[PDB]
């Protein structure tokens, strides 16, 4: 694979070549792949086998996960990036208690 | 995503934002997502792409996993929470040998 | 399972018995299994249940993943192996920034 605007990788703190789970709201597909960065603005491109799991225009949610010890886990707040129809970031924040944004 | 009554997260020791495997007894679907806590009692709500993998009323089993060294693993007992039709906890215990509850 | 020419395991730095994600470009299948090495040149053979997820001639992408601390992750470059129609390596390199090869 998933080639993603480097701006969105930066905003979400997802590294190039990081494993991500991608889920497609339109068709319900769920898969794992790794990211590739592109300088081309607004791009979210599914390459290879993943191409069969989406069509242009589909809405996807791209997630990265990490492992924590129990103590660190208690206080960790995930980073969330929201975008507009052009894949431009509109909000970058961290989750608060009870899914608050 | 899965928004879950904070009472059930507390009972199971699953943290908000923890990765969980969710399996649907009605339709056999199996997926991974992360939890969101809600103060609203009895709620188990599938958001986003996961919405396509269940209908209201479906029975689901929600599991979290952890990594252990070999020695710790020998003696670890998972936490199990059973609920009624209203998603109210009816039993909270730990597995004993041979799946005993 | 997946029995793979030891030459390709060597080239990619994937160990025998390592967990791999295999995705099939022809049919979109995605699965995880482990590798078995074979001395037989050019072989990529799906054994067991995985046999139902490909036909001879299908193009597959075989990936291994690893866990890193945040600092090491910043500078890690994955190894990539490209092959010809006979599964002979044509290029072995590491990813550079922005998916450059």
């Amino acid at each position: 694979x998933i080639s993603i605007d480097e701006k969105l990788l930066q905003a979400s703190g997802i590294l190039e070549y990081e494993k991500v789970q991608v889920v497609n709201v339109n068709n319900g597909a769920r898969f794992e792949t790794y990211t590739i960065a592109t300088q081309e603005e607004g791009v979210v491109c599914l390459n290879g086998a993943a191409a069969r799991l989406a069509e242009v225009g589909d809405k996807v949610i791209i997630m990265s996960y990490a492992d924590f010890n129990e103590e660190e886990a208690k206080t960790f707040k995930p980073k969330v990036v929201f975008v507009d129809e052009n894949n431009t970031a509109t909000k970058i924040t961290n989750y608060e208690k009870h899914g608050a944004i | 995503x899965i928004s879950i009554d904070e009472k059930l997260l507390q009972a199971s020791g699953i943290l908000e934002y923890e990765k969980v495997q969710v399996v649907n007894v009605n339709n056999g679907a199996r997926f991974e997502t992360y939890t969101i806590a809600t103060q609203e009692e009895g709620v188990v709500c599938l958001n986003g792409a996961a919405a396509r993998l269940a209908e209201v009323g479906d029975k689901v089993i929600i599991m979290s996993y952890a990594d252990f060294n070999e020695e710790e693993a020998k003696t670890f007992k998972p936490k199990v929470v059973f609920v009624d039709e209203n998603n109210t906890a009816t039993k909270i215990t730990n597995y004993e040998k041979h799946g005993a509850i | 399972x997946i029995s793979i020419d030891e030459k390709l395991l060597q080239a990619s730095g994937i160990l025998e018995y390592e967990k791999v994600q295999v995705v099939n470009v022809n049919n979109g299948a995605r699965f995880e299994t482990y590798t078995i090495a074979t001395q037989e040149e050019g072989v990529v053979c799906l054994n067991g249940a995985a046999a139902r997820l490909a036909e001879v001639g299908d193009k597959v992408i075989i990936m291994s993943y690893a866990d890193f601390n945040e600092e090491e992750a910043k500078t890690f470059k994955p190894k990539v192996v490209f092959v010809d129609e006979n599964n002979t390596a044509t290029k072995i390199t590491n990813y550079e920034k922005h998916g450059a090869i």
């Binding site: 491109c45 599914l46 809405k59 791209i62 990265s64 492992d67 924590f68 010890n69 990036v81 | 992360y34 | -």
Partner: peptide
Amino acid sequence: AMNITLLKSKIHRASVTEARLDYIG
């Protein structure tokens, strides 16, 4: 010691702009 897995970050509802089956890279 026991490790658990949390969501680290997400990009919510991005739009797919291209889907390239035969990608070489």
